[PDB]
Amino acid sequence: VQIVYK
Amino acid sequence: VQIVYK
Amino acid sequence: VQIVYK
Amino acid sequence: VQIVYK
Amino acid sequence: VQIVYK
Amino acid sequence: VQIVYK
Amino acid sequence: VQIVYK
Amino acid sequence: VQIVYK
Numbered sequence: 024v025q026i027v028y029k
Numbered sequence: 030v031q032i033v034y035k
Numbered sequence: 036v037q038i039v040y041k
Numbered sequence: 042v043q044i045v046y047k
Numbered sequence: 048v049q050i051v052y053k
Numbered sequence: 054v055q056i057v058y059k
Numbered sequence: 060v061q062i063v064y065k
Numbered sequence: 066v067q068i069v070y071k
Binding site: 038 | 060
Binding site: 054055 | 060061062063064065
């Protein structure tokens with residue numbers, strides 16, 4: 024699982 | 030699991 | 036598990 | 042487990 | 048994120 | 054993040 | 060982060 | 066961070 028916040 | 034906050 | 040805060 | 046705060 | 052293995 | 058192995 | 064092995 | 070091995 025990958026979650027990326029930008 | 031990877032979570033990255035930017 | 037990797038969590039990175041920037 | 043790696044947690045990095047920047 | 049929750050991952051459960053059974 | 055919670056990971057549970059059973 | 061919580062990891063539980065059973 | 067909590068890691069429990071059983």
